[PDB]
Write a protein that holds these residues in place. Sequence first.
Motif, PDB file in Angstrom:
ATOM      1  N   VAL A  13       0.835  -1.196   0.000  1.00 55.81           N
ATOM      2  CA  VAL A  13       0.000   0.000   0.000  1.00 55.81           C
ATOM      3  C   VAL A  13       0.876   1.254   0.000  1.00 55.81           C
ATOM      4  O   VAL A  13       1.770   1.392   0.827  1.00 55.81           O
ATOM      5  CB  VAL A  13      -0.916   0.047   1.242  1.00 55.81           C
ATOM      6  N   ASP A  14       0.601   2.165  -0.925  1.00 57.35           N
ATOM      7  CA  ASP A  14       1.352   3.415  -1.043  1.00 57.35           C
ATOM      8  C   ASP A  14       0.353   4.589  -1.140  1.00 57.35           C
ATOM      9  O   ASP A  14      -0.328   4.735  -2.148  1.00 57.35           O
ATOM     10  CB  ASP A  14       2.228   3.351  -2.301  1.00 57.35           C
ATOM     11  N   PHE A  15       0.275   5.426  -0.105  1.00 65.45           N
ATOM     12  CA  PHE A  15      -0.686   6.542  -0.099  1.00 65.45           C
ATOM     13  C   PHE A  15      -0.421   7.583  -1.187  1.00 65.45           C
ATOM     14  O   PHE A  15       0.700   7.978  -1.390  1.00 65.45           O
ATOM     15  CB  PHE A  15      -0.700   7.233   1.274  1.00 65.45           C
ATOM     16  N   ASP A  16      -1.453   8.053  -1.877  1.00 65.45           N
ATOM     17  CA  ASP A  16      -1.241   9.033  -2.951  1.00 65.45           C
ATOM     18  C   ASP A  16      -0.800  10.429  -2.483  1.00 65.45           C
ATOM     19  O   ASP A  16      -1.337  10.954  -1.511  1.00 65.45           O
ATOM     20  CB  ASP A  16      -2.501   9.149  -3.797  1.00 65.45           C
ATOM     21  N   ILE A  56       6.528   6.352   6.303  1.00 60.50           N
ATOM     22  CA  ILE A  56       5.368   7.121   6.723  1.00 60.50           C
ATOM     23  C   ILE A  56       4.163   6.924   5.804  1.00 60.50           C
ATOM     24  O   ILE A  56       3.035   7.226   6.177  1.00 60.50           O
ATOM     25  CB  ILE A  56       5.685   8.625   6.779  1.00 60.50           C
ATOM     26  N   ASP A  57       4.377   6.427   4.594  1.00 59.60           N
ATOM     27  CA  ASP A  57       3.222   6.246   3.738  1.00 59.60           C
ATOM     28  C   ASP A  57       3.165   4.961   2.920  1.00 59.60           C
ATOM     29  O   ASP A  57       2.480   4.905   1.902  1.00 59.60           O
ATOM     30  CB  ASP A  57       3.068   7.455   2.831  1.00 59.60           C
ATOM     31  N   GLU A  58       3.883   3.934   3.359  1.00 54.34           N
ATOM     32  CA  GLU A  58       3.838   2.659   2.659  1.00 54.34           C
ATOM     33  C   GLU A  58       3.960   1.467   3.615  1.00 54.34           C
ATOM     34  O   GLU A  58       4.627   1.539   4.643  1.00 54.34           O
ATOM     35  CB  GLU A  58       4.911   2.592   1.550  1.00 54.34           C
TER      36      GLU A  58
HETATM   37 CA   LIG Z   1       3.054   7.743  -1.920  1.00 56.80          CA
END
Ligand SMILES: [Ca+2]
Length: 342
Positions: free
Chosen positions: A7-10, A105-107
Amino acid sequence: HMIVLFVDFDYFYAQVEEVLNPSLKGKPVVVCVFSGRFEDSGAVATANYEARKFGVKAGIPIVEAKKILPNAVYLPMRKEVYQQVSSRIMNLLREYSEKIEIASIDEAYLDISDKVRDYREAYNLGLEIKNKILEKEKITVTVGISKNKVFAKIAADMAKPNGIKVIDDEEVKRLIRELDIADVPGIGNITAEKLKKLGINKLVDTLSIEFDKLKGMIGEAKAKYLISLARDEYNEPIRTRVRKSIGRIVTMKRNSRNLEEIKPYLFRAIEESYYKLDKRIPKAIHVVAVTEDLDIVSRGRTFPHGISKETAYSESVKLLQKILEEDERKIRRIGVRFSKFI
DNA sequence: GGGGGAAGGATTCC
DNA sequence: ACGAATCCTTCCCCC
Ligand SMILES: [Ca+2]
Ligand SMILES: Nc1nc2c(ncn2[C@H]2C[C@H](O)[C@@H](COP(=O)(O)OP(=O)(O)OP(=O)(O)O)O2)c(=O)[nH]1
Ligand SMILES: [Ca+2]
Ligand SMILES: [Ca+2]
């Protein structure tokens, strides 16, 4: 048969700012890191896609960004806030698997092997997770699914933004032959350049070279990593990562070599490094200096016991003296890093 | 010849 | 132009 969900936040930092102030959506948003040297000295931490359409992306100077998009919305980076929003999203993910690796922090990577079989169920579990995160925190993310962590990550890079993708065993084999080696995680411009001279532009090309030659030019670890991936054999387990270092580094109003002038910044750095240490006690401390030519020099010391803040203060000045003494350049940025927690 | 570790720099990427 | 992890090279102490 290990099945991995990444999962990688946009455009994360900018998206959090949008979530916290929805009127921002649709408008180009640029999250900045202001250094304080002058007007808009500093760099962009990241920008939403509206701004990226025009070249404003992570890494470019704020001044260059404003020349391109003078009417964009420019906001100072608020990492604490983004980190807390991230933590909550990571907690939601822990619900889909007990084997989770928070990579940053985002994956995060989730091992959903004993959670579902074949990729169809994989794909569907992805939409659920996406939807769940969209509904709960209102953050869009991209999902990557493959046989190991590296290809799950690659799957996500290919489907960004707000996407979901599966790379099945067949496409993996195609990518090992097709993928630009530069797009393989862990391969930067430096290693990319070294790999070209050796005639390696694809993973597959690493098998047509003498191992000792590879090892000789990029190192043993990297060499084994790439060969392993080319042999469709990479298979690192998804584990829990733990913080290993806490640090702080600030830009001085002006460059300097005067000890009494640098101290206040260095001490400011330690103060905030300690507040972030929580209850963690470090045995090692390093003073980090960024010189006027943007070079990074450092001097540290490991103790046989924890470091009290009074000790850190005293030792930090000694290390800064070692730096000034051993390096002739002026110092631009100064900070500290604490590690080897008891 | 090597284990075992500390130290400074190199390289990568949130 | 604005934080943290892993690996690499070089030393070093020693059995
Ligand atoms: Ca990202
Ligand atoms: N200060 C600073 N922060 C960065 C930098 N690069 C990334 N970050 C932070 C803010 C990014 O939103 C966050 C996630 O990094 P990503 O590379 O995944 O980019 P983002 O998530 O912004 O865009 P994306 O949709 O994944 O292409 O990490 C940087 O160069 N400087
Ligand atoms: Ca990321
Ligand atoms: Ca690359």
